[PDB]
Ligand binder design. Structure first.
Ligand SMILES: C[C@H](N)C(=O)NS(=O)(=O)OC[C@H]1O[C@@H](n2cnc3c(N)ncnc32)[C@H](O)[C@@H]1O
Length: 156
């Protein structure tokens, strides 16, 4: 596993979820669409870790591959103005580059929100730190791993 992918594996291990495995695939997983095709999953099963900057800090939004994050909803949930983090901010905050941003192992653990639609799948796939890394897990484990709060995040 490449460094960033290893960093994520390490985080899964340190959390007590060592049985979850990061895989650096022979096919791209840069976008939810590609990720789903790479593992034969439904796009909705892909977890997009989206980082947004607020006035007093950063926030992690775990969105289903089939939904579009509603900034209006996110803003209300946090209770303050929010904005999509620039590629640069993603790197400084999380330590990973967009297209590979994982839900764990960041430079600072960010308060998180989980797209309630992810609770509809028995298993989901999140990014493992690179545009080729992914690790499968149950929504429950993703919740335990991030301590995120379930929420209505989609524009739809
Ligand atoms: C799972 C897959 N590896 C992945 O990383 N999916 S992702 O949705 O989290 O990554 C793509 C998302 O990053 C964000 N993004 C893409 N380009 C961006 C840019 N130029 N600036 C800020 N955010 C961007 C958008 O939400 C885009 O949908």
């Amino acid at each position: 596993l490449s460094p960033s992918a290893r960093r994520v594996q390490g985080a899964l291990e340190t959390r007590g979820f060592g049985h979850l495995k990061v895989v650096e695939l022979p096919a791209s997983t840069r976008t939810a669409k590609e990720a789903a095709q790479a593992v034969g999953a439904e796009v909705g099963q892909i977890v997009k870790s989206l980082v947004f900057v607020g006035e007093k800090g950063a926030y992690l939004f775990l969105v289903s591959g089939k939904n579009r994050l509603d900034l209006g909803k996110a803003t209300r949930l946090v209770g303050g103005p929010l904005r999509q983090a620039t590629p640069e901010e993603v790197r400084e905050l999380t330590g990973f580059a967009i297209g590979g941003v994982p839900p764990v192992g960041h430079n600072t653990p960010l308060p998180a929100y989980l797209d309630e639609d992810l609770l509809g799948y028995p298993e989901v796939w999140a990014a493992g730190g690179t545009p080729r890394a992914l690790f499968r897990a149950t929504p429950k484990e993703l919740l335990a791993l991030t301590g995120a709060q379930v929420a209505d995040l989609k524009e739809g």
